[PDB]
Swiss-Prot record, chains A, B:
Molecular-function annotations in GO: acyltransferase activity, transferring groups other than amino-acyl groups
Cited Pfam families: Acetyltransf_1
Source organism of this protein record: Bacillus subtilis (strain 168)
UniProt-listed InterPro entries: AcTrfase_GNAT_prd (IPR017255), Acyl_CoA_acyltransferase (IPR016181), GNAT_dom (IPR000182)
Signal peptide location: none
Subunit structure: Homotetramer.
CDD domains referenced in this protein's UniProt entry, alphabetically: NAT_SF
PANTHER family: N-ACETYLTRANSFERASE, RIBOSOMAL-PROTEIN-ALANINE ACETYLTRANSFERASE
Protein name, UniProt field: Uncharacterized protein YqjY
All residue ranges annotated as the N-acetyltransferase domain in the record: 2-157
Length: 157, 157
């Protein structure tokens, strides 16, 4: 079977462990502070099949721009199709934030992350117009610091 | 002169670069991604004198526990006393989150960060009871990951 539920503080260990197991054994720079598991639980989820986690999503509603929801981090188990599980997580997140007054969802990725650019485009996200172009995609120069250009996604919901 | 204002997305470069100077130590693990400057602006502040930043505070209202406000990061110019600039940043933050319905404020630090433990204690924060003790302070073991013990502060407002 399958189920999706909101996260709890006790899920920290389980989720952070896969950051070392789902990305081909390559250490990710970005980490996930405990604060997300404690303060943005109602808009963060874990999907599973027969009590075994298949994916997760961490997100929240913008506070200074309430009509906007933000997806910070998500991942899908290697043995599962990225689109199916990922789509389920994004769909439940979207329905949840719509009930909070959000009319659009945002997130970001690196200009060289074609996997993410493809994934978000397939899900219907547009890209915000930045200041430079990288491989034909509009980008926000040094968005996350020097040499850290970012592609900003946005989807009306 | 002097002023206190809410942060804007464009303050990202200034704050992150100055912060590095204030520390004056070896490379620190990135803890301030751009998302904080874009989505929690009404509860994040910058203090300055003669157009030069003297301090900043990044915080937000908990979403899954609305009566709780959380301070993620704050810093004060080394040439300035913490209980002067810092107290001001914390007081403006508290006044702001009380208007959002918050009745308590939380934050965290490492049990070996005596500067932070002293500062928060002086401001009136209590420490939450964790699972172990480090240097006589109650701590939450591996709160931010393996080996990342944390002291959890809390104060009613």
């Amino acid at each position: 079977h399958m189920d999706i539920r909101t996260i709890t503080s006790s899920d920290y260990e389980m989720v952070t462990s896969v950051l070392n197991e789902w990305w081909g054994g390559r250490q990710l720079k970005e980490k996930l502070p405990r604060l997300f598991f404690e303060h943005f639980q109602d808009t963060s989820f874990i999907t599973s099949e027969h009590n075994s986690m298949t994916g997760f999503l961490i997100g929240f509603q913008s506070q200074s721009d309430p009509e906007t929801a933000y997806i910070h981090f998500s991942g899908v188990h290697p043995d599962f199709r990225k689109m199916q599980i990922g789509k389920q997580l994004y769909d439940v997140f979207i329905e949840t934030v719509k009930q909070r007054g959000c009319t659009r969802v945002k997130c970001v990725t690196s200009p060289v992350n074609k996997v993410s650019i493809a994934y978000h485009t397939k899900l219907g996200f547009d890209i915000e117009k930045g200041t430079k172009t990288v491989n034909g995609i509009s980008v926000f120069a040094n968005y996350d610091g020097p040499g850290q250009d970012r592609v900003l996604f946005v989807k009306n919901i």
